[PDB]
Amino acid sequence: NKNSSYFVEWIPNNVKTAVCDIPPRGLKMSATFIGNSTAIQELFKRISEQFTAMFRRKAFLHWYTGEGMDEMEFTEAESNMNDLVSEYQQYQDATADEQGEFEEEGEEDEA
Amino acid sequence: HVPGGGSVQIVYKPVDLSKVTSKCGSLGNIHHKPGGGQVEVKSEKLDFK
């Protein structure tokens, strides 16, 4: 209620709650947090740009191929993380605003 | 090569209440029934013929 601006509003409540009876040894009460803020795009966006800028001059690869790795597989993993990055970027700021199952019909004249 | 990814599509779909159909007994009526017979038919005027 204090903010919706940092919560995904098209998931009506983003929250899963639980309350166990027993605290950790030497403590009175506690909580564990596990979250997914779309901010996490930056992580992977770092990794897949840092990858691509070394790969664009083939640096270090000789050590990789030496264990018979395939040179095509770099291109594939970095492409897959660019799809994964794009996934957060498109679901960030995505619509709570509604759209209906209704098509264009030629039912009127011009006025 | 041109890096920066290809393209990925969002999962989003339009919504409708499908013109859904149910039963209604109340919808089948607008008018009430007429009254019963309030009139005597047994009465006699007792004329000595």
PDB file of C-alpha atoms in Angstrom:
ATOM      1  CA  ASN A   1       0.000   0.000   0.000  1.00  0.00           C
ATOM      2  CA  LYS A   2       3.047   2.148   0.783  1.00  0.00           C
ATOM      3  CA  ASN A   3       4.141   1.496  -2.816  1.00  0.00           C
ATOM      4  CA  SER A   4       2.890  -0.427  -5.852  1.00  0.00           C
ATOM      5  CA  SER A   5       5.612   1.267  -8.034  1.00  0.00           C
ATOM      6  CA  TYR A   6       8.220  -1.458  -7.224  1.00  0.00           C
ATOM      7  CA  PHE A   7       5.671  -4.378  -7.515  1.00  0.00           C
ATOM      8  CA  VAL A   8       4.303  -6.072 -10.716  1.00  0.00           C
ATOM      9  CA  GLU A   9       0.663  -4.858 -10.618  1.00  0.00           C
ATOM     10  CA  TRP A  10      -0.663  -7.413 -13.211  1.00  0.00           C
ATOM     11  CA  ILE A  11       0.220 -10.091 -10.597  1.00  0.00           C
ATOM     12  CA  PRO A  12      -2.502  -8.993  -8.062  1.00  0.00           C
ATOM     13  CA  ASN A  13      -0.423  -9.733  -4.940  1.00  0.00           C
ATOM     14  CA  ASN A  14       3.238 -10.705  -5.639  1.00  0.00           C
ATOM     15  CA  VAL A  15       3.622 -12.227  -2.144  1.00  0.00           C
ATOM     16  CA  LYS A  16       4.013 -15.760  -0.713  1.00  0.00           C
ATOM     17  CA  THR A  17       3.948 -15.932   3.144  1.00  0.00           C
ATOM     18  CA  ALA A  18       4.770 -18.671   5.719  1.00  0.00           C
ATOM     19  CA  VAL A  19       5.306 -18.695   9.558  1.00  0.00           C
ATOM     20  CA  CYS A  20       7.296 -21.581  11.091  1.00  0.00           C
ATOM     21  CA  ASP A  21       7.127 -22.228  14.875  1.00  0.00           C
ATOM     22  CA  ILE A  22      10.914 -22.718  15.465  1.00  0.00           C
ATOM     23  CA  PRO A  23      13.624 -19.950  15.199  1.00  0.00           C
ATOM     24  CA  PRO A  24      17.372 -20.546  14.466  1.00  0.00           C
ATOM     25  CA  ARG A  25      19.497 -21.646  17.499  1.00  0.00           C
ATOM     26  CA  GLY A  26      20.393 -18.534  19.582  1.00  0.00           C
ATOM     27  CA  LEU A  27      17.692 -16.229  18.012  1.00  0.00           C
ATOM     28  CA  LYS A  28      14.101 -15.171  19.045  1.00  0.00           C
ATOM     29  CA  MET A  29      12.388 -14.676  15.615  1.00  0.00           C
ATOM     30  CA  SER A  30      13.506 -14.256  11.947  1.00  0.00           C
ATOM     31  CA  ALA A  31      12.466 -14.071   8.263  1.00  0.00           C
ATOM     32  CA  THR A  32      13.952 -15.291   4.922  1.00  0.00           C
ATOM     33  CA  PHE A  33      13.402 -13.180   1.754  1.00  0.00           C
ATOM     34  CA  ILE A  34      13.401 -14.509  -1.855  1.00  0.00           C
ATOM     35  CA  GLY A  35      12.485 -11.821  -4.479  1.00  0.00           C
ATOM     36  CA  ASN A  36      12.479 -11.205  -8.274  1.00  0.00           C
ATOM     37  CA  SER A  37      12.636  -7.495  -9.145  1.00  0.00           C
ATOM     38  CA  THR A  38      12.985  -6.943 -12.944  1.00  0.00           C
ATOM     39  CA  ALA A  39      15.919  -4.630 -12.026  1.00  0.00           C
ATOM     40  CA  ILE A  40      17.861  -7.954 -12.298  1.00  0.00           C
ATOM     41  CA  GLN A  41      18.021  -7.334 -16.011  1.00  0.00           C
ATOM     42  CA  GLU A  42      21.216  -5.333 -15.388  1.00  0.00           C
ATOM     43  CA  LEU A  43      23.131  -8.473 -14.158  1.00  0.00           C
ATOM     44  CA  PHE A  44      22.631 -10.518 -17.261  1.00  0.00           C
ATOM     45  CA  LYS A  45      22.936  -7.359 -19.402  1.00  0.00           C
ATOM     46  CA  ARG A  46      26.399  -6.812 -17.960  1.00  0.00           C
ATOM     47  CA  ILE A  47      27.365 -10.487 -18.476  1.00  0.00           C
ATOM     48  CA  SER A  48      26.194 -10.644 -22.116  1.00  0.00           C
ATOM     49  CA  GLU A  49      27.895  -7.349 -23.084  1.00  0.00           C
ATOM     50  CA  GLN A  50      31.167  -8.196 -21.325  1.00  0.00           C
ATOM     51  CA  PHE A  51      31.084 -11.623 -23.020  1.00  0.00           C
ATOM     52  CA  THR A  52      30.431 -10.148 -26.478  1.00  0.00           C
ATOM     53  CA  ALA A  53      33.232  -7.567 -26.239  1.00  0.00           C
ATOM     54  CA  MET A  54      35.890 -10.155 -25.462  1.00  0.00           C
ATOM     55  CA  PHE A  55      34.353 -12.625 -27.983  1.00  0.00           C
ATOM     56  CA  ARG A  56      34.397  -9.952 -30.802  1.00  0.00           C
ATOM     57  CA  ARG A  57      38.282 -10.309 -30.804  1.00  0.00           C
ATOM     58  CA  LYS A  58      38.272 -14.089 -29.858  1.00  0.00           C
ATOM     59  CA  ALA A  59      40.211 -13.436 -26.624  1.00  0.00           C
ATOM     60  CA  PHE A  60      40.947 -16.448 -24.345  1.00  0.00           C
ATOM     61  CA  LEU A  61      39.124 -18.940 -26.597  1.00  0.00           C
ATOM     62  CA  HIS A  62      42.144 -21.098 -27.330  1.00  0.00           C
ATOM     63  CA  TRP A  63      41.964 -22.572 -23.841  1.00  0.00           C
ATOM     64  CA  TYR A  64      38.247 -23.397 -24.373  1.00  0.00           C
ATOM     65  CA  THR A  65      38.573 -25.083 -27.803  1.00  0.00           C
ATOM     66  CA  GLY A  66      41.518 -27.024 -26.453  1.00  0.00           C
ATOM     67  CA  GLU A  67      39.028 -29.009 -24.387  1.00  0.00           C
ATOM     68  CA  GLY A  68      37.316 -29.539 -27.733  1.00  0.00           C
ATOM     69  CA  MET A  69      34.537 -26.947 -27.073  1.00  0.00           C
ATOM     70  CA  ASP A  70      32.606 -25.760 -30.047  1.00  0.00           C
ATOM     71  CA  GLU A  71      33.151 -22.191 -31.245  1.00  0.00           C
ATOM     72  CA  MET A  72      29.438 -21.970 -32.256  1.00  0.00           C
ATOM     73  CA  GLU A  73      28.287 -22.490 -28.606  1.00  0.00           C
ATOM     74  CA  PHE A  74      29.559 -19.072 -27.407  1.00  0.00           C
ATOM     75  CA  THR A  75      27.302 -17.408 -30.015  1.00  0.00           C
ATOM     76  CA  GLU A  76      24.423 -19.554 -28.713  1.00  0.00           C
ATOM     77  CA  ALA A  77      24.736 -18.965 -24.942  1.00  0.00           C
ATOM     78  CA  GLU A  78      25.196 -15.169 -25.405  1.00  0.00           C
ATOM     79  CA  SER A  79      22.201 -15.137 -27.812  1.00  0.00           C
ATOM     80  CA  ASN A  80      20.169 -17.028 -25.196  1.00  0.00           C
ATOM     81  CA  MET A  81      21.025 -14.507 -22.423  1.00  0.00           C
ATOM     82  CA  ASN A  82      20.171 -11.641 -24.810  1.00  0.00           C
ATOM     83  CA  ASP A  83      16.688 -13.250 -25.169  1.00  0.00           C
ATOM     84  CA  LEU A  84      16.591 -13.651 -21.329  1.00  0.00           C
ATOM     85  CA  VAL A  85      17.620  -9.967 -20.844  1.00  0.00           C
ATOM     86  CA  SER A  86      14.966  -8.816 -23.331  1.00  0.00           C
ATOM     87  CA  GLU A  87      12.456 -10.909 -21.303  1.00  0.00           C
ATOM     88  CA  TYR A  88      12.893  -8.667 -18.222  1.00  0.00           C
ATOM     89  CA  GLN A  89      12.976  -5.489 -20.326  1.00  0.00           C
ATOM     90  CA  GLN A  90       9.585  -6.371 -21.934  1.00  0.00           C
ATOM     91  CA  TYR A  91       7.902  -7.556 -18.647  1.00  0.00           C
ATOM     92  CA  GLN A  92       9.173  -4.411 -16.807  1.00  0.00           C
ATOM     93  CA  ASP A  93       6.514  -1.616 -17.170  1.00  0.00           C
ATOM     94  CA  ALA A  94       4.139  -4.167 -18.856  1.00  0.00           C
ATOM     95  CA  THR A  95       0.379  -3.348 -18.839  1.00  0.00           C
ATOM     96  CA  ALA A  96      -2.229  -3.821 -16.116  1.00  0.00           C
ATOM     97  CA  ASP A  97      -4.456  -1.923 -18.674  1.00  0.00           C
ATOM     98  CA  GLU A  98      -7.077  -4.198 -20.353  1.00  0.00           C
ATOM     99  CA  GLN A  99      -7.546  -5.306 -24.029  1.00  0.00           C
ATOM    100  CA  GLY A 100     -10.733  -7.021 -25.384  1.00  0.00           C
ATOM    101  CA  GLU A 101     -11.166 -10.036 -27.783  1.00  0.00           C
ATOM    102  CA  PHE A 102     -12.862  -7.667 -30.327  1.00  0.00           C
ATOM    103  CA  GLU A 103     -11.974  -7.207 -34.020  1.00  0.00           C
ATOM    104  CA  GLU A 104     -12.398  -4.536 -36.695  1.00  0.00           C
ATOM    105  CA  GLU A 105     -15.716  -4.697 -38.596  1.00  0.00           C
ATOM    106  CA  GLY A 106     -16.806  -2.799 -41.711  1.00  0.00           C
ATOM    107  CA  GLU A 107     -20.115  -1.776 -40.032  1.00  0.00           C
ATOM    108  CA  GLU A 108     -20.144   2.009 -40.610  1.00  0.00           C
ATOM    109  CA  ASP A 109     -19.849   4.827 -43.103  1.00  0.00           C
ATOM    110  CA  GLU A 110     -17.580   7.858 -42.714  1.00  0.00           C
ATOM    111  CA  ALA A 111     -18.836  10.717 -40.431  1.00  0.00           C
TER     112      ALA A 111
ATOM    113  CA  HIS B   1      28.721 -10.076 -36.606  1.00  0.00           C
ATOM    114  CA  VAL B   2      25.959  -7.835 -35.103  1.00  0.00           C
ATOM    115  CA  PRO B   3      25.498  -8.718 -31.364  1.00  0.00           C
ATOM    116  CA  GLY B   4      22.697  -7.428 -29.009  1.00  0.00           C
ATOM    117  CA  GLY B   5      20.299 -10.388 -29.491  1.00  0.00           C
ATOM    118  CA  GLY B   6      17.620 -11.215 -31.996  1.00  0.00           C
ATOM    119  CA  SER B   7      13.996 -10.634 -30.839  1.00  0.00           C
ATOM    120  CA  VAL B   8      11.711 -12.264 -28.187  1.00  0.00           C
ATOM    121  CA  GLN B   9       7.878 -11.952 -27.994  1.00  0.00           C
ATOM    122  CA  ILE B  10       5.773 -11.241 -24.847  1.00  0.00           C
ATOM    123  CA  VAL B  11       3.007 -13.611 -23.609  1.00  0.00           C
ATOM    124  CA  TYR B  12      -0.114 -11.351 -23.530  1.00  0.00           C
ATOM    125  CA  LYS B  13      -3.697 -12.165 -24.632  1.00  0.00           C
ATOM    126  CA  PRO B  14      -7.019 -10.225 -24.869  1.00  0.00           C
ATOM    127  CA  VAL B  15      -9.993 -10.988 -22.515  1.00  0.00           C
ATOM    128  CA  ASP B  16     -13.800 -11.588 -22.880  1.00  0.00           C
ATOM    129  CA  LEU B  17     -16.797 -13.030 -20.872  1.00  0.00           C
ATOM    130  CA  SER B  18     -17.747 -15.221 -23.925  1.00  0.00           C
ATOM    131  CA  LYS B  19     -21.505 -14.195 -24.120  1.00  0.00           C
ATOM    132  CA  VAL B  20     -22.062 -16.941 -21.488  1.00  0.00           C
ATOM    133  CA  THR B  21     -25.475 -18.587 -21.008  1.00  0.00           C
ATOM    134  CA  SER B  22     -27.273 -19.943 -17.894  1.00  0.00           C
ATOM    135  CA  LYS B  23     -30.857 -20.704 -16.712  1.00  0.00           C
ATOM    136  CA  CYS B  24     -33.348 -18.159 -15.343  1.00  0.00           C
ATOM    137  CA  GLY B  25     -36.875 -19.084 -14.174  1.00  0.00           C
ATOM    138  CA  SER B  26     -37.713 -15.437 -13.138  1.00  0.00           C
ATOM    139  CA  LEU B  27     -37.027 -14.040 -16.709  1.00  0.00           C
ATOM    140  CA  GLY B  28     -39.924 -16.130 -18.161  1.00  0.00           C
ATOM    141  CA  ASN B  29     -42.644 -13.940 -16.461  1.00  0.00           C
ATOM    142  CA  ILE B  30     -43.986 -10.312 -16.511  1.00  0.00           C
ATOM    143  CA  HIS B  31     -47.698 -10.719 -15.427  1.00  0.00           C
ATOM    144  CA  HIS B  32     -49.683 -12.111 -12.447  1.00  0.00           C
ATOM    145  CA  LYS B  33     -52.654 -14.580 -12.605  1.00  0.00           C
ATOM    146  CA  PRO B  34     -56.321 -13.333 -12.407  1.00  0.00           C
ATOM    147  CA  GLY B  35     -58.320 -13.853  -9.137  1.00  0.00           C
ATOM    148  CA  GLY B  36     -60.624 -16.750  -8.095  1.00  0.00           C
ATOM    149  CA  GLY B  37     -64.468 -16.723  -8.330  1.00  0.00           C
ATOM    150  CA  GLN B  38     -65.865 -14.333  -5.602  1.00  0.00           C
ATOM    151  CA  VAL B  39     -69.586 -14.956  -6.544  1.00  0.00           C
ATOM    152  CA  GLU B  40     -72.354 -17.068  -4.985  1.00  0.00           C
ATOM    153  CA  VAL B  41     -74.273 -19.593  -7.182  1.00  0.00           C
ATOM    154  CA  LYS B  42     -76.222 -21.493  -4.416  1.00  0.00           C
ATOM    155  CA  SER B  43     -78.563 -18.671  -3.317  1.00  0.00           C
ATOM    156  CA  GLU B  44     -82.342 -18.948  -3.926  1.00  0.00           C
ATOM    157  CA  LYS B  45     -85.180 -16.334  -3.603  1.00  0.00           C
ATOM    158  CA  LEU B  46     -87.685 -18.794  -1.964  1.00  0.00           C
ATOM    159  CA  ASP B  47     -90.798 -18.051  -4.141  1.00  0.00           C
ATOM    160  CA  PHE B  48     -93.885 -20.163  -3.234  1.00  0.00           C
ATOM    161  CA  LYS B  49     -94.915 -21.270  -6.785  1.00  0.00           C
TER     162      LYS B  49
END
